[PDB]
């Protein structure tokens, strides 16, 4: 039936709008993995709309952009794949899955490296410390003081290694601060 | 019956990945409407999923579960009717009506301000230029040299008007650069 | 703040490898790259290799591939860079730095019998 | 590999003057539009101290005298104005490709 199906899509709509209402700006680690979760298996079921309408097709014309559509998100879904096990050589973290950008980003945080997604891997890299914690755009990686920042990250991605280097840091308010991570190196392969 | 929504779902995902995969980096205004058009239309979709659920009610347990939580995303829907509005009525700026924040943060850029959705809003606010382009918290504004960089930029929330202080700004490697915005007062309304 | 200590000089016979410690303090070990940079003749600046002490990917120079192996012992926070038949082209000045910006203070390598 | 070169061999300069030290990378070093130029100096028996990173970024500590330009395969670094304590070593080292090779370096001299 369509019906079962028409709920497990509403259930998919409604968990994002959880998450794009009361867990947007929330940073938890755990939330964050769900919502990247979440970002993976849409495109399972990108293909499964559009395979179900490929099967059962209303019209010729109907099915035949939907058997394009699916091809055109599984040719989508496996670049992702290249290119994230391609990342995964490279940096060997798990974060390399994650289904929104194929590059990383290294903060040595309390001894273990944080490693986080990072979306845009730029020059520069804005370092912002609130209440005493820090967050590199716009990761919530945890407790850290302006004396306490790490001296240097640096910034996996495929085929390239970015070192960044911790440039002026300015204390504001007490526990807050900020910090400039400006590129120094490339670790290319 | 029933099919062709299965292929408007399918078109909705499509979107949804390629807006999350293709254009996720890009901060193309006109696309970042576009996915802030995408993002206002998923609760009347999630709704929509729902109250076809709830109209086809083979199953009490099933169809009891779709009206209940249509309500759950039709008040979360007005909910940002009502957060949105409030918005407008202190800002007067059509960017309240986004559907991912109810906080405003306007950049004088250029002369006009820049006023753009603002997820956060806490007491240091990052701008990073790159390539003498201006981004902040996310935002591609656009020319913008350390010279020429806003010495105060005003955050804009329901009852809270924050005004943000350019505390100090470094430049890096050239065109690029870095500077922060320390609150410095608040326009409570 | 970041201090890096190194090991004294040695007087190495040719053909023979060395193991050059350098000990880190003020920092989390694991945290930044380790560089190793050889000062030849006293003014020749070569670039040996990087050792990330995280994980222990390294990447060294061409010239120093088989010459060189980077090492890292976490219990301790020491680096070790482990040359590999010294001849008289290595009587020269190793450096460990982290950022560029810290610096040990150079283990001078005499490669004579 | 790439070859960088500095000109002049050393520097003679007197105090409170501007000492210009070229570094000519044999390939451009353009990553991203921008050049990765690591300016270091090195007094006798001490390590190298690092100057500049990213051909204009200078590093904390380092007083606000020694400035990078250049852009391309030109690299300067300006020293305005010299003190007593300036007469050193200064290599260049391109932070861009494997190896990152340092440059010949030059000996500045203090004119008295």
């Known amino acids: 039936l369509l019906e079962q199906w028409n709920l497990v899509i509403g259930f998919l709509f409604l968990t994002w709008i959880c998450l794009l209402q009361f867990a947007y700006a929330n940073r938890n680690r755990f939330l964050y993995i769900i919502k990247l979760i979440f970002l993976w298996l849409l495109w399972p079921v990108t293909l499964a709309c559009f395979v179900l309408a490929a099967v059962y097709r209303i019209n010729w014309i109907t099915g035949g952009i939907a058997i394009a559509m699916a091809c055109l998100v599984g040719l989508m879904w496996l670049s992702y794949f290249i290119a994230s096990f391609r990342l995964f050589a490279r940096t060997r973290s798990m974060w390399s899955f994650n289904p929104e950008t194929n590059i990383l980003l290294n903060v040595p945080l309390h001894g273990t490296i944080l490693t986080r997604p990072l979306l845009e891997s730029e020059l520069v890299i804005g370092a912002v410390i609130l209440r005493g914690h820090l967050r590199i755009a716009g990761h919530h990686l945890g407790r850290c003081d302006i004396k306490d920042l790490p001296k240097e990250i640096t910034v996996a991605t495929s085929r390239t290694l970015s070192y960044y280097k911790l440039g002026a840091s300015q204390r504001v308010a007490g526990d807050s601060g900020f910090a400039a991570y400006s590129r120094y190196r490339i670790g290319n392969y | 019956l029933l099919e062709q929504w299965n292929l408007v779902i399918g078109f909705l995902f499509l979107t949804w990945i390629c807006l999350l995969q293709f254009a996720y980096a890009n901060r193309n205004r006109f696309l970042y409407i576009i996915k802030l058009i995408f993002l206002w239309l998923l609760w009347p979709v999630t709704l929509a999923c729902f109250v076809l659920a709830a109209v086809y009610r083979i199953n009490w347990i099933t169809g009891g579960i779709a009206i209940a939580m249509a309500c759950l995303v039709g008040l979360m829907w007005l909910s940002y009717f009502i957060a949105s509005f409030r918005l407008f009525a202190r800002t007067r700026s059509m960017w309240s009506f986004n559907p991912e924040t109810n906080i405003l943060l306007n950049v004088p850029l250029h002369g006009t301000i820049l006023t753009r959705p603002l997820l956060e809003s806490e007491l240091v606010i990052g701008a990073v230029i790159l390539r003498g382009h201006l981004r902040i918290a996310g935002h591609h504004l656009g020319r913008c040299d350390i010279k020429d960089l806003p010495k105060e930029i005003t955050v804009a929330t329901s009852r809270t008007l924050s005004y943000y202080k350019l505390g100090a700004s470094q430049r890096v490697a050239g065109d690029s650069g870095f500077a922060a915005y320390s609150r410095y007062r608040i326009g409570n309304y | 703040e970041v201090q890096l200590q190194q090991s004294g000089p040695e007087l190495v016979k040719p053909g023979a490898s060395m193991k050059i410690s350098c000990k880190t303090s003020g920092y989390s070990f694991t945290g930044y790259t380790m560089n190793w940079v050889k000062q030849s003749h006293g003014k020749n600046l070569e670039w040996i290799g990087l050792?990330?002490?995280?994980?222990?990917?390294?990447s060294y120079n061409q010239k120093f591939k088989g010459k060189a192996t980077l090492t890292v012992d976490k219990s301790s926070s020491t680096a070790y860079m482990e040359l590999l038949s010294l001849t008289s082209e290595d009587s020269a000045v190793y450096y460990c730095?982290?950022?560029?910006?810290?610096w040990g203070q150079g283990t001078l390598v005499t490669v004579s019998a | 590999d790439i070859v960088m070169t500095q000109s002049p061999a050393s520097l003679a300069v007197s105090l409170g003057q501007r000492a210009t030290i070229s570094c000519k990378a044999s390939?451009?070093?353009?990553?991203?539009?921008?050049?990765?130029m690591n300016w270091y100096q090195q007094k006798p028996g001490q390590p190298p101290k690092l100057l500049i990173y990213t051909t204009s970024n200078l590093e904390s500590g380092i007083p606000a005298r020694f400035s990078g330009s250049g852009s391309g395969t030109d690299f300067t670094l300006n020293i305005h104005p010299v003190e007593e304590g300036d007469a050193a070593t200064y290599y260049c080292?391109?932070?861009?490709?494997?190896?990152?090779?340092f440059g010949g370096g030059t000996k500045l001299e203090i004119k008295r």
């Open positions: 390939q451009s070093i353009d990553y991203d539009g921008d050049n990765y």
């Open positions: 080292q391109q932070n861009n490709e494997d190896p990152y090779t």
């Open positions: 730095e982290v950022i560029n910006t810290y």
């Open positions: 050792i990330n002490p995280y994980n222990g990917d390294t």
